[PDB]
Motif scaffolding. Structure first.
Motif, PDB file in Angstrom:
ATOM      1  N   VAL A 154      42.523   6.987  31.259  1.00  0.00           N
ATOM      2  CA  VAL A 154      41.920   6.073  30.105  1.00  0.00           C
ATOM      3  C   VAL A 154      40.138   5.735  30.329  1.00  0.00           C
ATOM      4  CG1 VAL A 154      41.929   4.676  28.107  1.00  0.00           C
ATOM      5  CG2 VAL A 154      43.869   5.589  29.105  1.00  0.00           C
ATOM      6  N   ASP A 155      40.097   5.243  31.610  1.00  0.00           N
ATOM      7  CA  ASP A 155      38.571   5.270  32.063  1.00  0.00           C
ATOM      8  C   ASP A 155      37.568   6.297  32.017  1.00  0.00           C
ATOM      9  OD1 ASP A 155      38.606   2.339  32.443  1.00  0.00           O
ATOM     10  OD2 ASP A 155      39.679   2.656  34.448  1.00  0.00           O
ATOM     11  N   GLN A 156      38.437   7.488  32.435  1.00  0.00           N
ATOM     12  CA  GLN A 156      37.579   8.589  32.435  1.00  0.00           C
ATOM     13  C   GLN A 156      37.267   9.210  31.204  1.00  0.00           C
ATOM     14  OE1 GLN A 156      38.227  11.283  36.575  1.00  0.00           O
ATOM     15  NE2 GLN A 156      40.322  10.761  35.597  1.00  0.00           N
ATOM     16  N   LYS A 157      38.255   8.981  30.161  1.00  0.00           N
ATOM     17  CA  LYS A 157      38.213   9.430  29.034  1.00  0.00           C
ATOM     18  C   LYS A 157      36.997   8.600  28.052  1.00  0.00           C
ATOM     19  CE  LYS A 157      41.883  10.937  27.268  1.00  0.00           C
ATOM     20  NZ  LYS A 157      43.207  11.761  26.799  1.00  0.00           N
ATOM     21  N   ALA A 158      37.171   7.435  28.303  1.00  0.00           N
ATOM     22  CA  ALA A 158      36.122   6.281  27.872  1.00  0.00           C
ATOM     23  C   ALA A 158      34.878   6.821  28.030  1.00  0.00           C
ATOM     24  CB  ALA A 158      36.335   4.883  28.190  1.00  0.00           C
ATOM     25  N   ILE A 159      34.459   7.161  29.505  1.00  0.00           N
ATOM     26  CA  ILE A 159      33.277   7.598  29.904  1.00  0.00           C
ATOM     27  C   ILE A 159      32.810   8.934  29.198  1.00  0.00           C
ATOM     28  CG2 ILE A 159      31.915   8.481  31.915  1.00  0.00           C
ATOM     29  CD1 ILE A 159      33.729   6.252  33.550  1.00  0.00           C
ATOM     30  N   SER A 160      33.722  10.102  29.303  1.00  0.00           N
ATOM     31  CA  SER A 160      33.421  11.112  28.515  1.00  0.00           C
ATOM     32  C   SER A 160      33.260  10.961  27.082  1.00  0.00           C
ATOM     33  CB  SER A 160      34.512  11.903  28.616  1.00  0.00           C
ATOM     34  OG  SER A 160      34.769  12.373  29.747  1.00  0.00           O
ATOM     35  N   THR A 161      33.791  10.134  26.375  1.00  0.00           N
ATOM     36  CA  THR A 161      33.644   9.598  24.760  1.00  0.00           C
ATOM     37  C   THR A 161      32.193   9.339  24.815  1.00  0.00           C
ATOM     38  OG1 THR A 161      35.916   9.165  24.594  1.00  0.00           O
ATOM     39  CG2 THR A 161      34.479   8.447  22.947  1.00  0.00           C
ATOM     40  N   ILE A 162      31.898   8.196  25.610  1.00  0.00           N
ATOM     41  CA  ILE A 162      30.532   7.695  25.390  1.00  0.00           C
ATOM     42  C   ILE A 162      29.623   8.732  25.537  1.00  0.00           C
ATOM     43  CG2 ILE A 162      28.949   6.089  26.590  1.00  0.00           C
ATOM     44  CD1 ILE A 162      31.570   4.606  27.567  1.00  0.00           C
ATOM     45  N   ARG A 163      29.599   9.653  26.676  1.00  0.00           N
ATOM     46  CA  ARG A 163      28.572  10.610  26.885  1.00  0.00           C
ATOM     47  C   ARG A 163      28.413  11.494  25.705  1.00  0.00           C
ATOM     48  NH1 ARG A 163      30.662  11.395  33.311  1.00  0.00           N
ATOM     49  NH2 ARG A 163      28.639  10.406  34.202  1.00  0.00           N
ATOM     50  N   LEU A 164      29.752  11.933  25.147  1.00  0.00           N
ATOM     51  CA  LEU A 164      29.584  12.762  24.251  1.00  0.00           C
ATOM     52  C   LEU A 164      29.421  12.316  22.829  1.00  0.00           C
ATOM     53  CD1 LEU A 164      32.583  15.094  25.134  1.00  0.00           C
ATOM     54  CD2 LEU A 164      30.415  15.475  25.280  1.00  0.00           C
ATOM     55  N   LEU A 165      29.464  11.106  22.536  1.00  0.00           N
ATOM     56  CA  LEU A 165      28.779  10.440  21.278  1.00  0.00           C
ATOM     57  C   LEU A 165      27.413  10.431  21.319  1.00  0.00           C
ATOM     58  CD1 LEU A 165      31.356   7.184  20.797  1.00  0.00           C
ATOM     59  CD2 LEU A 165      31.084   9.506  19.265  1.00  0.00           C
ATOM     60  N   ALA A 166      26.888  10.054  22.514  1.00  0.00           N
ATOM     61  CA  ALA A 166      25.498   9.834  22.853  1.00  0.00           C
ATOM     62  C   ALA A 166      24.621  11.440  22.626  1.00  0.00           C
ATOM     63  CB  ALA A 166      24.978   9.537  23.995  1.00  0.00           C
ATOM     64  N   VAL A 167      25.306  12.558  23.160  1.00  0.00           N
ATOM     65  CA  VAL A 167      24.879  13.950  22.961  1.00  0.00           C
ATOM     66  C   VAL A 167      25.086  14.417  21.648  1.00  0.00           C
ATOM     67  CG1 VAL A 167      25.610  16.190  23.568  1.00  0.00           C
ATOM     68  CG2 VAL A 167      25.342  14.406  25.513  1.00  0.00           C
ATOM     69  N   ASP A 168      26.065  13.831  21.175  1.00  0.00           N
ATOM     70  CA  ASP A 168      26.336  14.341  19.536  1.00  0.00           C
ATOM     71  C   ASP A 168      25.331  13.759  18.685  1.00  0.00           C
ATOM     72  OD1 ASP A 168      28.375  16.268  19.986  1.00  0.00           O
ATOM     73  OD2 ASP A 168      29.890  15.006  19.573  1.00  0.00           O
ATOM     74  N   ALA A 169      25.055  12.402  19.081  1.00  0.00           N
ATOM     75  CA  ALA A 169      24.011  11.552  18.054  1.00  0.00           C
ATOM     76  C   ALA A 169      22.479  12.447  18.215  1.00  0.00           C
ATOM     77  CB  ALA A 169      23.959  10.353  18.405  1.00  0.00           C
ATOM     78  N   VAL A 170      22.278  12.535  19.360  1.00  0.00           N
ATOM     79  CA  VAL A 170      20.945  13.301  19.558  1.00  0.00           C
ATOM     80  C   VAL A 170      20.819  14.684  18.870  1.00  0.00           C
ATOM     81  CG1 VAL A 170      19.428  14.273  21.184  1.00  0.00           C
ATOM     82  CG2 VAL A 170      20.458  12.158  21.749  1.00  0.00           C
ATOM     83  N   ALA A 171      22.168  15.336  18.941  1.00  0.00           N
ATOM     84  CA  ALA A 171      22.150  16.634  18.417  1.00  0.00           C
ATOM     85  C   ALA A 171      21.986  16.659  17.061  1.00  0.00           C
ATOM     86  CB  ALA A 171      23.604  17.344  18.758  1.00  0.00           C
TER      87      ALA A 171
END
Ligand code: T5X
Ligand code: T5X
Ligand code: CA
Ligand code: CA
Lengths: 675, 675
Positions: free
Chosen positions: B2-19
């Motif tokens: 779940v820690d790995q999933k959280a980190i991926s979620t954070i990364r992808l939210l940030a990337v998607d926001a910029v996108a």
């Protein structure tokens, strides 16, 4: 010994100067006299030619200690006398309370604001390295001079010095030799109250060499040896730790009280008696000291004489480089250099003024070798590097060479500003520039103001000038920034509207000899204007659209000139006839004749200003002002302009209201005044 | 996991926001997501109570990375949603391109201008230490929170961070834990081009503890362990070196291109697929992640619940301190605190406004415990310390204690400004101040502007306001400085003329909740004015001398009000009747009713301004302006005033010329405008 007598003479001149003014700072002069004596004995300089390009430079970064500097200059026979010392801190004197390069012969830069001088020294040393790399040849050491800087604890606390020291270490500036007055006292008392860092360890972390002199109150042999040691370390700047007693010799030595106020009369008497001087005499200059100092001047003058012959031989062997060097030392730009400036027509495409700036630099850098510059980690955003140029770096890094022309300042705006001042101070016609976003020029205000006071022709390439930058938002969008710098004496603040105006801005910036320039440039594209030219924009303000039956004149700058032109069309539909004035530089405009200025801003017509920033200053040129006096917003730039009604219709509405407001009123030019 | 999933979620939210914005900075969010995840798991906070006084604070000093911060706040259930993330960088959204404390729930401070956030963190930590020392008792850990800061290479290059880091090390601020994003990339490319210092060695030289995490792209165990280690070192701030890959996971990872522009669509697809997300989906929030984060929020809320009971028990055991603490947490000053403000009459002696300021502080500091402040090495010059108070220092030094109220900032104006912002950001009604000379407030412009944008009630005690300082000369004498700050939105710039006005200025500064104050104070003595009062001066501008048949009104500030009064007498001999207006704060005046303002600056009478600094802004209030738009001079202050004709006769001459200029003209208040 004569050395001991010289040191006492220096100390007592400084103390007597402060006493005569009943104002100033005796402490650091007392503590640093031995070091000043030792350093000036090692320095090559001509008091009769302050501009010899191969002189060693000295910078007093702890400028409050200027009674020390003035004493040295007087003793060495610069154009500064004991009579001038007697007028220390007096209105109109050549011995002001902090050193000013415009007023004091032998003051390389203007100090007093702490931290600046060391950064200026970094710039002098950067320029020397670039200059030497450009001109020196085998058997022709045209430039081989050193940069000596004195600084105190206050300079070391100011962040600007950290920036410049990090960068100087990175740049391996081996001809920079700085001396820290390690006296453990500042205004608030012991440095133990606020400044307990390991300074030496910090300077090692920057890649500086260190020499420590544990008894700098007396050990001039060790200070001289420290200089010799520093000269052997050719790939690191050196910090010499001078452990001194502030106010050495005073009854109040080693206290904050001796920092910044005149000594008591009885204290001065005991200083004199224990050093063998007459306590009834002030401003004593033993002829032994004069003689000793004159010997060193005569030797230095023979060195300069030989340098002049070296330069003559250089011109014979390297005629092209020699002529270039001569021209630069004469303070002249290349003949017709400005023919390289790009020119545009209204048929050309829209271009952001940051990109127009890149194009100008690309054309003029190859034509004008004395142009160098850089950016504070915004090279691909400011567009400040000409393609095909090499960065200024030590060759040992593989990343550039000292002959390079482009400086990677890092995220160091304040030090960039002060280093630019040092590069200008070096001389040789250097025309140097520094890029950042306009909003972050404010980080460097300490240095920018000194560019103005010092009359240095430096240039800020200040992009992203407004809400036009868009999404980065209000932390990045200038509001107050132009007003701040326009309100500072002697700053040309160019805000060009288009290609031709951008070329005029650079013409002014590069031709400058006494006025710093800030070029406020856009992120966003702007059209080429009908009616612009380098010739007209060079007047600072000009009539873009003349309307002989104008109901109103709209005066604007930069991105708002095109807006004004579009508003003129809207107004025509409302039955209102407008003229447009473009005011790319208020300072240059102000310097034009009264008749010229009136031709642009006549009597008998209301005048509305439009600029998406503070309205401060604009009443000089207008009756009503449409500006932005609140912070910006994060969004797409056109949406921000629409929000704040900086639209053709929004401008027209305010223009129509202005016309109505003055119906039945007598209107005279904003240029008129009562006194 | 779940820690790995959280980190991926954070990364992808940030990337998607910029996108979605097609604007912003994905690189640092990708590199710092593991650290953000680890730090927020260790932090105590309540998303439903952003002002809990014992929360840990987080500061994103590298504010361009704000898509990371916003993602954390959304995932933790602050008042910020995925719908807000979809509006990243869009006009009016709660997700602006850099974090703004006024707009973003959970943003403690406003960052984006590099270097500021780390300094703000120093201030939050300073405040926490002072607060804990003031209130904690045995079995009552009222305050025991930490300050976590993320920063990048740019922050480390900015001199302001060096200043604050030197000071924080000196102050032994053990609850400060900073994390350096060591990714070796800035906008201009590799840090090898400009930033090759040994950062870790520098931080050791300041007295910081260091923890290195060599694989911060993945090793969250080591990041958590680094926090635990830092918490054991109670007498040093800690720097955690996070060695990361900028843009980790991107095809363009480890390049400057990934710093500051949206990723390519195909890059985002491969990010999603290799982390197990759907490449066709944007703004995914796996419910596992929400659940995990909610567990930590629920635990934190139970901690706050227990803290509330601790506080209730504290009020029972320590009723006086408990009531004081409650009042402060309610945002209320002590009842009738302002009865302590000194009041003067025209029979009282002349006093410099710096000395009047000392006297005010001496009276109000004992009455208002939430006042703390300091000076940037100008304590005996600014007169900022109340006799009998203790300095804020770690007790281990013997030089003060954390319960102290007076801060020795050293020669660090910019960091002082940003630290003041942090102290204000801490909350608990802190009303904090910082002294320097007005001219050197300019060194801190980066922070001052953020005080305004952030709406923090900080106060600059800015002495030596003009050429009135005399001999130190033009490097010390403000010209542009008031215009600069008055042109900045939301800054109250008080320039009090006398004792009563100085008390009004402090009343405003201390009562402020959303507006920073600069108090421009004199070196030189000024008389007590006939007609001044706290009541009238609290209006920002007021009629000092009313003249019902005025030929002219003279509006002035500070030292020039007495000058105007003397000019009125000269004018009387010339047959000219003048009124006088005192305008101690233009912002406060502007906020008064239109009718009040017109009562002070009426229609039908010419108005002349007098202030020995820039004339910018003054046309808001006057028809003609007598100011100083050139640099000053080094000499005795009265001689400088005489040189520039700031004399009763010089003012009268210009007043008479103003009257003559408007003879036969219709004159309306400068307050009138067309729109
Ligand atoms: C950027 C900046 N900030 C503060 C100062 C103020 N300051 C400076 C001055 O302004 C002189 O340059 C003041 O001594 C004013 O003359 C005082 O005015 P009054 O109180 O007599 O009216 S010097 C200084 C700190 C000196 O610490 P250092 O350790 O650098 O020097 P030293 O070893 O004590 O000689 C400090 C803190 C400055 N010059 N520049
Ligand atoms: C005081 C100051 N000076 C320069 C900057 C400029 N700057 C910043 C920005 O402004 C973002 O905050 C720019 O990325 C603008 O968004 C660019 O605008 P466009 O060119 O797209 O129009 S960030 C920055 C340096 C970043 O270096 P770091 O090492 O701190 O960060 P990272 O590891 O690369 O993420 C630098 C140098 C600043 N923010 N603050
Ligand atoms: Ca010192
Ligand atoms: Ca970086």
């Amino acid at each position: 010994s004569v050395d001991q007598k010289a040191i006492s003479t220096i100390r007592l001149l400084a103390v007597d100067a402060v006493a005569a003014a009943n104002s100033g700072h005796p402490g650091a002069p007392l503590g640093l006299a031995p070091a000043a004596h030792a350093v000036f004995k090692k320095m090559r300089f001509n008091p009769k030619d302050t501009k010899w390009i191969n002189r060693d430079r000295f910078v007093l970064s702890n400028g409050h200690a200027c009674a020390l500097l003035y004493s040295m200059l007087v003793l060495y026979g610069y154009d500064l006398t004991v009579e001038d010392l007697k007028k220390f801190r007096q209105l109109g004197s050549k011995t002001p309370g902090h050193p000013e390069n415009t007023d004091v012969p032998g003051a390389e830069v203007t100090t007093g604001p702490l931290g600046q001088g060391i950064c200026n020294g970094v710039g002098i040393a950067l320029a020397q390295a670039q200059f030497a790399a450009t001109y020196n040849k085998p058997d022709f050491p045209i430039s081989d001079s050193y940069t000596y800087v004195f600084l105190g604890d206050g300079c070391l606390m100011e962040g600007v010095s950290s920036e410049a020291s990090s960068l100087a270490g990175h740049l391996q500036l081996g001809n920079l030799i700085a001396f820290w007055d390690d006296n453990k006292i500042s205004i608030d008392g012991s440095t133990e109250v606020a400044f307990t860092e390991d300074v030496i360890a910090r300077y090692k972390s920057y890649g500086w060499h260190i020499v420590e002199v544990s008894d700098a109150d007396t050990d001039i042999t060790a200070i001289a040896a420290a200089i010799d040691e520093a000269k052997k370390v050719t790939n690191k700047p050196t910090l010499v730790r001078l452990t001194t007693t502030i106010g050495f010799g005073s009854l109040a030595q080693g206290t904050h009280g001796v920092h910044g106020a005149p000594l008591k009369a009885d204290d001065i008497k005991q200083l004199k008696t224990k050093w063998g001087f007459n306590p009834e005499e002030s401003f004593a200059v033993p002829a032994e000291v004069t003689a000793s100092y004159n010997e060193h001047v005569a030797e230095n003058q023979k060195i300069q004489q030989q340098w002049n012959e070296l330069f003559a031989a250089y011109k014979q062997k390297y005629p092209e480089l020699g002529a270039e060097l001569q021209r630069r030392l004469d303070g002249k730009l290349p003949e017709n250099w400005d023919k390289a400036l790009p020119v545009y027509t209204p048929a050309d495409a829209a271009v952001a003024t940051r990109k127009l700036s890149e194009i100008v630099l690309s054309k003029i850098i190859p034509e004008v070798p004395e142009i160098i510059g850089g950016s504070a980690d915004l090279t691909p955003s400011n567009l400040t590097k000409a393609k095909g140029t090499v960065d200024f770096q030590p060759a040992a890094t593989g990343l550039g060479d000292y002959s390079g022309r482009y400086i990677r300042y890092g995220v160091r705006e304040h030090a960039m500003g002060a280093i630019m001042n040092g590069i200008a101070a070096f001389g040789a016609n250097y025309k140097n520039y520094g890029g950042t976003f306009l909003n972050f020029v404010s980080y460097a205000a300490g240095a920018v103001r000194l560019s103005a006071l010092s009359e240095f022709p430096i240039t800020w390439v200040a992009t992203h000038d407004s809400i036009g930058l868009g999404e980065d938002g209000p932390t990045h969008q200038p509001i107050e920034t132009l007003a701040h710098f326009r309100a500072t004496p002697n700053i040309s603040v160019w805000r060009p509207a288009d290609g031709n105006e951008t070329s005029a801005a650079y013409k002014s910036a590069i031709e400058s000899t006494h006025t710093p320039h800030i070029l406020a440039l856009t992120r966003q594209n702007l059209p080429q204007l009908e009616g612009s030219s380098i010739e007209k924009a060079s007047k600072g303000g000009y009539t873009l659209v003349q309307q002989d039956k104008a109901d109103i004149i709209i005066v604007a700058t930069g991105s708002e000139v095109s807006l004004a032109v579009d508003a003129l069309k809207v107004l025509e539909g409302q039955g209102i006839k407008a003229g447009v004035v473009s005011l790319p530089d208020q300072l240059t405009f102000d310097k034009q004749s009264e008749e010229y200025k009136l031709s642009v801003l006549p009597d008998g017509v209301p005048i509305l200003s439009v600029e998406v920033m503070s309205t401060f200053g604009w009443s000089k040129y207008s009756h009503q002002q449409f500006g932005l006096n609140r912070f910006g917003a994060s969004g797409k730039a056109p949406e921000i302009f629409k929000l704040f009604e900086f639209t053709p219709e929004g401008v027209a509405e305010r223009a129509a209201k202005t016309v109505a407001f003055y119906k039945g009123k007598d209107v005279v030019s904003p240029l008129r005044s009562a006194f």
